[PDB]
């Protein structure tokens, strides 16, 4: 009953340095400060095209036409005006509320909020220390700036507008997304577009049939990326070199990662072998044990006015560690099994489709058909509880709200990929 975004943001609201503030991201020193919005503890929204996270993607110039793949979309003018940034911000917050309004989404977002990147940044083993790429600098009305930890940033997409993805800064010796530590996750995403798909499985899994009659609910797309962030914040992402070739054409050499198959769920996720599944859980059970060991041996903390015991307790809250009467942390195998199974098998695109009761591709091995412009911010177009399929209208049945022919006022096709 409390909203996830407890405040009404307008893009032009003046900064306060707490939940509206110009910010700089780490090691992007030459970037201009960008206006950002802390929509929930540990979660910031930056309504800007992402020219910052990757220095080799510092502008919105497209590749030469011959080098653009069929499923790509370029418009260097998108998200350049205050009005678009306002609409982007409110679209993102509305999607967060839609997700939070399901028990599945409330759960996922709770995992994300407590999945604080581990304080493993010192060369001294016994010293807890933040890793600076898990922070941003938050500029204050008095001109000072304050370093702030955060788990999640939603940013606008780079030159390819439809390349939605969940990325994070790496570390000299730590693979933070796969050693249990976690790291701050940046999700390139836009609520202003969505993708056409086909209700017929034959057509949806054919690369050239159909033109994308049905529109994906962007809440599912966001939840998809949030599921990656969940894996990565708990440092349990599957290595991206574990992939399987799409054996249906083939000489294209297309591959999908296990991380993607897991994230989608459903029948897809059973292609991962049961022997590998138990092995991954064992590996990460051991990485969680290592973190509890590191915490038990921690003697000091630097770079904060917060106490050492509090910071230790933060990570007891994250990994659900047990504590004995000596204050020592340990991993409870029952809670770890449930935590792990929840992060990997419960939080899936397919399960979000069941909770949202929307129409959706039935497999990750489908083919995009079109991109549409949308506008979910008006309540007459899209709601927290119903998405496009407004229950109080003729769009309530047969997923008529996602039907871009029946609900054609809510979709402008921008490009056919076929």
């Amino acid at each position: 009953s409390m909203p996830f975004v407890n405040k009404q943001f307008n893009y032009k609201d003046p900064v306060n340095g707490v939940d509206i503030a110009y910010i700089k991201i780490p090691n992007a020193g030459q970037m201009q400060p960008v206006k950002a919005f802390k929509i929930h503890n540990k979660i910031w929204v930056i309504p800007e095209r992402d020219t910052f996270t990757n220095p080799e993607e510092g502008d919105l110039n497209p590749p030469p036409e011959a080098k653009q793949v069929p499923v790509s979309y370029y418009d260097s003018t998108y998200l350049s005006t205050d009005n678009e940034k306002d609409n982007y911000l409110k679209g993102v917050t509305k999607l967060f509320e839609r997700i939070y309004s399901t028990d599945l989404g409330r759960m996922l977002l709770t995992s994300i909020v407590r999945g604080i990147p581990f304080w493993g940044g010192s060369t001294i083993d016994t010293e807890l220390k933040v890793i600076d790429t898990n922070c941003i600098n938050v500029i204050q009305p008095d001109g000072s700036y304050r370093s702030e930890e955060l788990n999640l940033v939603i940013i606008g997409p780079s030159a390819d507008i439809i390349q939605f993805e969940c990325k994070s800064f790496g570390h000299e010796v730590l693979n933070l997304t796969r050693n249990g530590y976690g790291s701050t996750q940046y999700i390139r995403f836009s609520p202003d577009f969505t993708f056409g798909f086909e209700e017929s499985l034959e057509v949806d899994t054919n690369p050239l049939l159909g033109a994308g009659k049905f529109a994906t609910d962007p809440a599912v797309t966001l939840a998809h990326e949030l599921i990656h962030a969940g894996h990565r914040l708990y440092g349990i992402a599957i290595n991206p070199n574990r992939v399987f070739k799409v054996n249906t054409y083939e000489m294209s050499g297309l591959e999908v990662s296990f991380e993607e198959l897991r994230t989608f769920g459903g029948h897809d996720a059973k292609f991962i072998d049961s022997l590998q599944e138990n092995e991954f859980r064992l590996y990460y059970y051991n990485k969680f044990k290592d973190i509890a060991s590191t915490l038990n041996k921690a003697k000091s903390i630097v770079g904060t006015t917060a106490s050492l015991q509090y910071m230790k307790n933060v990570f007891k809250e994250k990994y659900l560690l047990s504590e004995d009467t000596s204050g020592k942390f340990s991993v409870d195998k029952l809670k770890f099994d449930k935590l792990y199974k929840m992060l990997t098998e419960i939080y899936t695109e397919d399960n979000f489709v069941k909770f949202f009761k929307v129409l959706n591709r039935k497999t990750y091995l489908n083919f995009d058909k079109a991109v549409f412009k949308i506008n979910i911010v008006p309540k007459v177009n899209y709601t927290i509880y119903d998405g496009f399929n407004l229950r109080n209208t003729n769009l309530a049945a047969n997923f008529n709200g996602q039907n871009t022919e029946i609900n054609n006022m809510n979709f402008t096709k921008l490009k056919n990929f076929t």
Partner: nanobody, 126 residues
Framework: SQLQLVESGGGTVQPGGTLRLSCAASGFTLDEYAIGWFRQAPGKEREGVSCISSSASISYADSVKGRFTISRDNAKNTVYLTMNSLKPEDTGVYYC???????????????????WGQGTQVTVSS
């Protein structure tokens, strides 16, 4: 919407008596905030009393174990401190303070407690 912490339930009791303090939170959810209770007697430092984390992990200062019980109603966004066997030493203004996710230590806490209320007066006297 607006951030607020309101302690209430204090008063004057006799040694051996009982009081239940309330800490009503507004503007944030106990789903992600720990709540600790503190007390300050005239002329002495603040001291921690008890804390209950966002996952209801509970701690007590030694001088209060077996006498006070901290508990929580997330539906009411309120934390309670039920105090039995009150002693003159328990006299003071009692405060509740939030901390994100986790409890701080009973002693030697830091800036993790970032917001607190105006307090409620507890007097234990014959």
């Amino acid at each position: 919407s607006q951030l607020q912490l309101v302690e209430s339930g204090g008063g004057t009791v006799q040694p051996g008596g009982t009081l239940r303090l309330s800490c009503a939170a507004s503007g944030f959810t106990l789903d992600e905030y720990a709540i600790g209770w503190f007390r300050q007697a005239p002329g002495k430092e603040r001291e921690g009393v008890s804390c209950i984390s966002s996952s209801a992990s509970i701690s007590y200062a030694d001088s209060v174990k077996g006498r006070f019980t901290i508990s929580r109603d997330n539906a009411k966004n309120t934390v309670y401190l039920t105090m039995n066997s009150l002693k003159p030493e328990d006299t003071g203004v009692y405060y509740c303070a939030r901390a994100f996710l986790a409890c701080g230590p009973v002693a030697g806490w830091g800036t993790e407690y970032d917001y607190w209320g105006q307090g409620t007066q507890v007097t234990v006297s014959s």
